[PDB]
Amino acid sequence: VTEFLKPRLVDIEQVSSTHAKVTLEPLERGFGHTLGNALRRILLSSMPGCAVTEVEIDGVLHEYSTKEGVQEDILEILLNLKGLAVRVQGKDEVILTLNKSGIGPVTAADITHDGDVEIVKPQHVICHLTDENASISMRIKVQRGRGYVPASTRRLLVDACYSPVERIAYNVEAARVEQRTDLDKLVIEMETNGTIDPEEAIRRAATILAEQLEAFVDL
Amino acid sequence: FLKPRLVDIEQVSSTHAKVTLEPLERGFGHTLGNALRRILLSSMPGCAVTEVEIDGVLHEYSTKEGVQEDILEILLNLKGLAVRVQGKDEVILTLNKSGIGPVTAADITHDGDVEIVKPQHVICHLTDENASISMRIKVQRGRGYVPASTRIRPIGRLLVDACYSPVERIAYNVEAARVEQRTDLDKLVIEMETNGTIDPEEAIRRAATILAEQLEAFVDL
Amino acid sequence: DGAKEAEIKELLKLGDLPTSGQIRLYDGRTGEQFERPVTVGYMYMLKLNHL
Amino acid sequence: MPYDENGTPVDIVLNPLGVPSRMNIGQILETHLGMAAKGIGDKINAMLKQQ
Amino acid sequence: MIKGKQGRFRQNLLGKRVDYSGRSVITVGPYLRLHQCGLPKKMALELFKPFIYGKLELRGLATTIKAAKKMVEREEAVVWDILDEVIREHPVLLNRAPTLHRLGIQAFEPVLIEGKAIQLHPLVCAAYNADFDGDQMAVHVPLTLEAQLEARALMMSTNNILSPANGEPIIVPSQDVVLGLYYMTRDCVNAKGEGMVLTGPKEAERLYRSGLASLHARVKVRITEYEKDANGELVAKTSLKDTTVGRAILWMIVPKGLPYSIVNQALGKKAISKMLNTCYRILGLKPTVIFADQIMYTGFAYAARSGASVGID
Amino acid sequence: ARVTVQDAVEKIGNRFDLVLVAARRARQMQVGGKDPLVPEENDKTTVIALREIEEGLINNQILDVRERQEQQEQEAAEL
Amino acid sequence: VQYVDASRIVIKVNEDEMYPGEAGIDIYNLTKYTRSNQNTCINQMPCVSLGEPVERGDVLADGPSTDLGELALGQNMRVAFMPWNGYNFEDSILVSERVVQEDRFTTIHIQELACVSRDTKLGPEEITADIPNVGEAALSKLDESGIVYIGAEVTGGDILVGKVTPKDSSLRVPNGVSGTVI
RNA sequence: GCAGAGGUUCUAGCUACACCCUCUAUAAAAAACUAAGGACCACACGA
Ligand SMILES: NCc1c[nH]c2nc(N)[nH]c(=O)c12
Ligand SMILES: [Mg+2]
């Protein structure tokens, strides 16, 4: 009466380090959606990350106003800044801003990883600088926050991208075990920024929900 | 991070009670409410009749003298019968009432392990003083819904579809908590319209467990 | 000679139900509220013998 | 199944697209009036549940 | 007896009743892919009974064919596993009662379902001209390797994207998915999340699920559209385009080859038909099939999330 | 599993011809003891034959050459 | 209502209604589950109890699809007009498991199977359970004479009578048909 | 049926397309083998 089929992770296919498609064959009737919905919201809006997009404006009076001498629009740089994953810094607060720039596309590598910044993708390009002499924008996102916080709620303000998983999809199909009533089979597709592996992100989300249910474990 | 508690469990009525989970953070409360509602509605332990043997009738699709309702009507009434059992999984309850007056769950012989939540509930109406009714109703615990055909001896025993779900209607309301030290916290209040057989706090804790063991699969070994 | 819509609105007003006839609804699976409140009410339903 | 704020799950979900072409707009009026009648019934039941 | 519909030549010679055939009512079951369909468990056991008997004999579970007949009556778990193997790659013809056009009979890969009703993939329901008002489809099982190969090569629904009458997609989305996309691919002057800048369509989907931005709010989001201008080569172009969040989300469904202009409109019914036609013309048939299936899934999901409802007010 | 035969029709232009050539290969695979050249991913012989056409392992000309080679092998067996 | 039962209802007519001689009671034998012309069930359910004053022309017992004297063809059921994941695609209808759990739309179907013993050549068919080469479980449901016991649940393909080919002709449940023998 | 004869069984079972076994005067030791009479007309309903 308390024994329910316990899901087993039959496959954890990783199309890319960022993209994984974990699937559990058994689960229970109408449980795959429940576990999937719970997991989706917890990683999407409650998994903490260290990317504070808002950084100090340099050489621009307004975020909408565009700095001259850089091919990319200021808004295009802001979108790239949101993209940089930045691995969790040991210090929670944002502490790093470096604007060093060179002619052509300027990558995240120039900002560098002072202390625990640990930029996930040096290859990712922050902006394209038309002038070699001009050094501007860049800066580093290092404040820990939970989920996505918009610019309106939270110098230069950018909508925060703290959430590690860029997009997650949960799909349910009915699969019977041997000869039995069909039971929900849930496949979760997770694309991560790159701070953590998608499978590791699933593990982190499960522990976070378990802590909420920790008080009511029936001893 | 913060962890919820069942700070308040108020029994506004015997049928339905409200359960409060105060220390819930933003976003966590709505997720827990939805997951708890789904897991409670889907699969909770419960007690319902599964086999009835009226002494005087052979099949459900027949009438019995002195009984206003049909035998199948008796089975339909007995299907939604408020029964709790603790101890052994299955128990047989015997009903024997004679004379005029509608029979009720109180008329059933009382056993130590089983106590009827709703004695006032009506099974059938005895319209003849001479006539009498005798039956043995078998109650076992199960989950979800089990059709009569899916289950499974003599012609006398009648198979009745079992609805083990004790909860009938469940709603969760998420509103901002009254804590002042840290804002944005939202308390979760869950009201469970139940047949009365299941304890509210126990049902919530059991659902939380079932979610936890189902969730324990995701974390790596 | 049946009820006009105004009479149905008044009857709804008699109950706690909104007079608009649209009640905010939430998904059973996700638990997320549907936009554009849906129409909910009891309509007589018939099963046909073409089982 | 979808559930309203009170938590009552709707038993039948119908495609609303049959209403525009097959102009049986009465079924929408039927649904609204049924909701009103059940609202009356629910208030009566609530009065009856308590003393 | 010789002449007329009553007459044998019309009555039987022209149309002969066939074995391995069955009828049942139709069911939607959107979860199915376009190529596959839903087949009742019990119906399949009767339809594929000779194949089941042969597989049981090859397995050695049934020593004799009389024993195999008894096993099918018993319906033991072993018989159901044997049915799954036979059902895996034997295409089943699905025929609407009035076969006005060749599309009326289309083969599908059968998928075992608990229900007693055949399920037809929703996109092909428009092709059949069938509804779910208790419509009934005859289901036939091709037997020979020639028959199965013919079914998979030509009869299968994926092959007949375009109607024979006109070079237009006959799998054009019909009722619910089009409404869901139209709700998705719509613009509002003011809604929560308006004016934001989004990293990509993935971020648009994440914002929508978070609920911070509605489906139909306009945002400035970059779109990486691949252009097939180089014959057989995809040239990636990334640009900031002022579009709604919903259109950004749908862009993930669209393959890389198609341009972003097609999604930027309202995407009604003629619009989605033109989208499918362009997909078939530019990309291969298989990308077109995947695109159509993804369209149907996304449309149903976002129509359900939309909560479209008809009311007197 | 091949749910789309468009690549196979590229290999055999007639498409109707593709059913016939695939049928001969599939018959050889099932009734005859002929190893599937394409790896079998839990696939029926008809799908394996279609996969072989898509691979280009089997074509109408290739099947004819293999049949002729088998006829020569039968003469060698006769000795 | 002098006496009411599911089988029959007894009304004691008022003296003004009562004719002077040989009168004073009206007995209505309600028809129980009977095979309908369309294989449904005609069930007469009493709607009154003892002591209830019943006026002339009042409905004593509801018939099939009748509720308190009102025609009740079906069930008033909760309806939500929304497109839900495409399950309701063209005109399809979703239904909650709650409806099935409450047996809201469950219907009794009465199927009448007739086995005819005939004066065949080489002797007549024998209705007695003399049939050989049959399962013992099938014979157990049959009585000594071969007729199935009243109220015995049977499944498609199970034997119901004992007709024997004169020296295997016994009627069996049609496949996909099941239920008690009323 | 090696030809004749008998045959376990898993209705009946050298032909229905059939098939196999053992045995030498007649049945008895053994496993593998296979699909049944439905005509016409009205009414009603569903697509
Ligand atoms: N049809 C032939 C036949 C009848 N009885 C049989 N018994 C056995 N062992 N073998 C058979 O071949 C036969
Ligand atoms: Mg139709």
mmCIF file with all atom_site columns, C-alpha atoms in Angstrom, chain C residues 34-50:
data_model
loop_
_atom_site.group_PDB
_atom_site.id
_atom_site.type_symbol
_atom_site.label_atom_id
_atom_site.label_alt_id
_atom_site.label_comp_id
_atom_site.label_asym_id
_atom_site.label_entity_id
_atom_site.label_seq_id
_atom_site.pdbx_PDB_ins_code
_atom_site.Cartn_x
_atom_site.Cartn_y
_atom_site.Cartn_z
_atom_site.occupancy
_atom_site.B_iso_or_equiv
_atom_site.pdbx_formal_charge
_atom_site.auth_seq_id
_atom_site.auth_comp_id
_atom_site.auth_asym_id
_atom_site.auth_atom_id
_atom_site.pdbx_PDB_model_num
ATOM 1  C CA . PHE C 1 34 ? -4.415  29.330 -17.615 1.00 0.00 ? 34 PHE C CA 1
ATOM 2  C CA . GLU C 1 35 ? -4.617  32.733 -19.219 1.00 0.00 ? 35 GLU C CA 1
ATOM 3  C CA . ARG C 1 36 ? -7.987  34.105 -20.325 1.00 0.00 ? 36 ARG C CA 1
ATOM 4  C CA . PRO C 1 37 ? -10.360 32.528 -17.746 1.00 0.00 ? 37 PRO C CA 1
ATOM 5  C CA . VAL C 1 38 ? -12.181 29.518 -19.152 1.00 0.00 ? 38 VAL C CA 1
ATOM 6  C CA . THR C 1 39 ? -15.893 28.732 -19.351 1.00 0.00 ? 39 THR C CA 1
ATOM 7  C CA . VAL C 1 40 ? -16.932 26.159 -16.733 1.00 0.00 ? 40 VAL C CA 1
ATOM 8  C CA . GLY C 1 41 ? -20.418 24.867 -15.993 1.00 0.00 ? 41 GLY C CA 1
ATOM 9  C CA . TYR C 1 42 ? -22.575 21.767 -15.894 1.00 0.00 ? 42 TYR C CA 1
ATOM 10 C CA . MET C 1 43 ? -23.879 20.695 -19.298 1.00 0.00 ? 43 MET C CA 1
ATOM 11 C CA . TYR C 1 44 ? -26.095 17.644 -19.654 1.00 0.00 ? 44 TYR C CA 1
ATOM 12 C CA . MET C 1 45 ? -24.049 14.843 -21.214 1.00 0.00 ? 45 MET C CA 1
ATOM 13 C CA . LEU C 1 46 ? -25.323 11.698 -22.919 1.00 0.00 ? 46 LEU C CA 1
ATOM 14 C CA . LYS C 1 47 ? -23.490 8.467  -23.567 1.00 0.00 ? 47 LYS C CA 1
ATOM 15 C CA . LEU C 1 48 ? -24.686 6.987  -26.828 1.00 0.00 ? 48 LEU C CA 1
ATOM 16 C CA . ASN C 1 49 ? -25.308 3.302  -27.423 1.00 0.00 ? 49 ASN C CA 1
ATOM 17 C CA . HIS C 1 50 ? -22.625 3.261  -30.155 1.00 0.00 ? 50 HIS C CA 1
#
